[PDB]
Design a binder for these strands. Sequence first.
DNA 1: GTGTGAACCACACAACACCCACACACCAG
DNA 2: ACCTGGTGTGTGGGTGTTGTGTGGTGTTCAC
Length: 218
Amino acid sequence: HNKASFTDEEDEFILDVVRKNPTRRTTHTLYDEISHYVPNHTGNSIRHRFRVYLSKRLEYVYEVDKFGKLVRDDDGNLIKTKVLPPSIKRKFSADEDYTLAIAVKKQFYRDLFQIDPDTGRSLITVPGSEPNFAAYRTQSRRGPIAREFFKHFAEEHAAHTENAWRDRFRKFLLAYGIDDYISYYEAEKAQNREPEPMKNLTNRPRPGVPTPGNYNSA
DNA sequence: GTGTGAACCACACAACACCCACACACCAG
DNA sequence: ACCTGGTGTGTGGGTGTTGTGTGGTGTTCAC
Ligand SMILES: [Ca+2]
């Protein structure tokens, strides 16, 4: 209802906002926010215009600091860069799912047998004999896991957050099976082919709850 | 009396709608 | 205090749908 053309000025405005909030280039909200200054168009309509009609023209973006604020030079001027900052939601590389599954198995093996996988070597000081990891199978174990496990892990592999790593463990690793993934990962790695991350394991809903990513007129 | 010449239906494609698995989140029991 | 399940939220990378400014083009004050 009442379609409108994107003017030269409106397009230039969109590009400018994206250049000024580059961490948010693939969001939906940013384009919704631009619709405040661009009354004729919707969030959906602005985002599409950019993505399809304008991105091939971006050329540069403006550089931003650690604190997510635009960086300025000595005399107030903004810094042009052909470097895109990281997005808000980072994806899981197979190497990350393996690094997670191993650390969980390590923690578990130490929680269970009270032995150091690698050294092994008792954590208390009874004399087994316990399985020589990777001989161990997680098999139905799902905890307990300390918030400290996730905190130090996220400290070590900062690409993802503590909450990010936990939910990857809960919804992805526990769904696929800790042993199942480690075996799969190693199977591939041996066969000179790069393995793939865990996918499609999300099993969740809702009544109302409108479809996300639809910033329309109504 | 025979030619150039100054509004219905299609249709390409832009405007806009809508999609959904999951990354990252927070809280309660 | 601690783990852990239940669940909110909106990003990321799209695809699906509709409305519309410009083709045909048919006549037509006929000039
Ligand atoms: Ca803005």
